[PDB]
Design a protein around this ligand. Structure first.
Ligand code: YM8
Length: 246
């Protein structure tokens, strides 16, 4: 038996009556979240233990470290070495997902959990979907995600590639980690902060608070044209991405 100890997000912390093991139980599209979870097995992805239908119950990893969101100090961010480490682990998780043809679609600090060792884990696959199957890519056309984190093509195009969208959102997460703020309400031309970035006014916040090395990476990630946007394999060759830090 598991005792429901407290509400995490519904989602509640459950604790094993015998072993005292802790798990997160999700109490409830749900069919796809379960299916997708069944496919997942990676150290930077929230573990899926199983499910039960009574109201549906999902048994997920308890990440006692909390949400990445709470490691970001407003207007400050966090130490660059910690940001880099979290970004490495995020890429590892995203790489894995894309490798098996899954796109998360809602990457943001609220959905990035930390275990007891502060290892990052991608959470919440309620919006995730298959973008590659039998080695054939399917373009996406449904709008979803979270405005400050979504790529501009999603607002501007009828169809778009899945992967560059996840890459973009990772770029926004990195920005948040290094500056403790989001660069814009949304990646649209009616958005002054977004226009300023497109005009490379990096003497303005949040870019001003970001060292030139990571900023160079951001210049490559937050590129409006998804076809010109840096890919993960190339992120792996980026100077800052490879810089020894602490
Ligand atoms: C509760 C989050 C809300 N999302 C928006 C991230 O959704 C999930 N949380 C999980 N674990 C978890 C969440 C915690 C939340 C707060 C604090 C602590 Cl210690 C937590 C420890 N572990 C696992 N899967 C999902 C899913 N889906």
């Amino acid at each position: 038996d598991w005792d429901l100890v407290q509400t995490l997000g519904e989602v509640q912390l459950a604790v094993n009556r015998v072993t005292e093991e802790a798990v997160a139980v999700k109490i409830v599209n749900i069919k796809k979240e379960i299916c997708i979870n069944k496919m997942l097995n990676h150290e930077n992805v929230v573990k899926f233990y199983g499910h039960r239908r009574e109201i549906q119950y999902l048994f997920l990893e308890y990440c006692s470290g909390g949400e990445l969101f709470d490691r970001i100090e407003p207007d400050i961010g966090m130490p660059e070495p910690d940001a880099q480490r979290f970004f490495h682990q995020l890429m590892a998780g995203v790489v894995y997902l894309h490798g098996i043809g899954i796109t998360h679609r809602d990457i943001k600090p609220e959905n990035l959990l930390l275990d007891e060792r502060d290892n990052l884990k991608i959470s919440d696959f309620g919006l995730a979907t298959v973008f590659r199957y039998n080695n054939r890519e399917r373009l996406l056309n449904k709008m979803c995600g979270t405005l400050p984190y979504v790529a501009p093509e999603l607002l501007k195009r009828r169809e778009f590639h899945a992967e560059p969208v996840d890459v973009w959102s990772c770029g926004i997460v990195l920005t948040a980690m290094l500056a403790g703020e989001l660069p814009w309400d949304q990646p649209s031309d009616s958005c002054q902060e977004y226009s300023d970035w497109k005009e490379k006014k990096t003497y303005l916040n949040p870019w001003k608070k970001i060292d030139s090395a990571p900023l160079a990476l951001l210049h490559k990630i937050l590129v409006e044209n998804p076809s010109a946007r840096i890919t993960i394999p190339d992120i792996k060759k980026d100077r800052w991405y490879n810089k020894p830090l602490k």
